[PDB]
Amino acid sequence: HWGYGKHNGPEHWHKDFPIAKGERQSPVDIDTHTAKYDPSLKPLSVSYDQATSLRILNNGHAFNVEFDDSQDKAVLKGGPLDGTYRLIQFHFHWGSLDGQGSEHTVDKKKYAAELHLVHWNTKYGDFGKAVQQPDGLAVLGIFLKVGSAKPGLQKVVDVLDSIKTKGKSADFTNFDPRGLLPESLDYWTYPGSLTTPPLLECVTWIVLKEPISVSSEQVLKFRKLNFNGEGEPEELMVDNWRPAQPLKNRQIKASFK
Numbered sequence: 293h294w295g296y297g298k299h300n301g302p303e304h305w306h307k308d309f310p311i312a313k314g315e316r317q318s319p320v321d322i323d324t325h326t327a328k329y330d331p332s333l334k335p336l337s338v339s340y341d342q343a344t345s346l347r348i349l350n351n352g353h354a355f356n357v358e359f360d361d362s363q364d365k366a367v368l369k370g371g372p373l374d375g376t377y378r379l380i381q382f383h384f385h386w387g388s389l390d391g392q393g394s395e396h397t398v399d400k401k402k403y404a405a406e407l408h409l410v411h412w413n414t415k416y417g418d419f420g421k422a423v424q425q426p427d428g429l430a431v432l433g434i435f436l437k438v439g440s441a442k443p444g445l446q447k448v449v450d451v452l453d454s455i456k457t458k459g460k461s462a463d464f465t466n467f468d469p470r471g472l473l474p475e476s477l478d479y480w481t482y483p484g485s486l487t488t489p490p491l492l493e494c495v496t497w498i499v500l501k502e503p504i505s506v507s508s509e510q511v512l513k514f515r516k517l518n519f520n521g522e523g524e525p526e527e528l529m530v531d532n533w534r535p536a537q538p539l540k541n542r543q544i545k546a547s548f549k
C-alpha cells in the first residue's frame with residue numbers, strides 16, 4: 293500500500309488517491325514575501341489546559357499521540373477559524389538528516405521536522421463527518437530545528453522504544469501538548485489538505501512562523517522507529533514527508549504585519 297519509498301511514495305499516491313493532483317493539496321512552499329498580512333484574522337486561541345492524551349500508536353507511517361476528544365477539552369479557535377475545533381491527535385514528519393524532514397517550507401527552507409496538531413470542527417459532530425467538509429479540519433503546524441533540547445518532548449521520545457514497529461501501541465496518558473509550542477503564535481494560514489492518503493481537502497492550515505528547537509538526540513530517537521512491523525526486515529522510519537505541492541493560486545495570509 294502507500295508509503296514513502298521509490299515504488300509507493302508520494303509520486304505514486306495519485307493512482308490510488310487521484311485527489312493527490314487536486315486544487316488544494318498540501319504541503320506548500322510558503323513564500324513569505326507573497327503572503328499578505330490580514331487584519332480580518334481574529335486572535336488565535338490555543339486552549340490545551342484540559343487536554344487528555346490516551347495512547348501513542350506506530351501506524352507504519354508515523355506515530356500518533358491520540359486524545360480523548362469526547363468533550364470540549366483541548367480546542368483551537370480564533371485566527372482564520374469560525375467556531376471551535378477540537379484536538380484529536382498529533383504526529384510528526386521528519387527526515388533521515390537534519391537538513392530535511394518538514395512538509396511545509398519557508399522560502400524553500402526545509403526544517404528537520406514538522407509537528408501537526410490535528411483538530412476537527414465541532415459543528416460536524418466528530419472527525420469522520422468533519423473530513424467530509426471543506427472546513428472540517430484545522431491543523432496547527434510547528435517546525436522543528438535541531439539545537440537545544442525541548443524538555444516537553446522528552447516524554448514522547450522516551451516512549452518510542454515501546455512502539456518501534458508498525459501496529460504497536462502503548463498507554464500514553466497525561467501528556468501536555470502545551471510543552472510543544474513556541475513562544476509566538478504568529479502564523480501563516482491557507483486552505484489545503486491532509487498530507488497523507490487519503491489527502492482529503494478539508495484542512496485550514498495554520499503554520500507557526502517560530503520553530504521549536506529539539507536536540508539531535510531527540511530527533512535521532514524518532515529515526516530509530518520502523519516502517520515495517522515486528523519480525524519483518526528493518527526499514528527505518530525516516531523521510532516520512534510529502535514535498536511541496538502546487539499552490540494553484542491559493543493565497544497565503546499572515547497573521548503578523
Ligand SMILES: S=c1[nH]c2ccccc2s1
Nearest residue numbers: 408410431485486487488
Ligand atoms: S497532516 C494530517 N495527516 C492526517 C492523517 C489522518 C487524520 C488527520 C490528519 S492531518
Ligand SMILES: [Zn+2]
Nearest residue numbers: 383385408487
Ligand atoms: Zn501530518
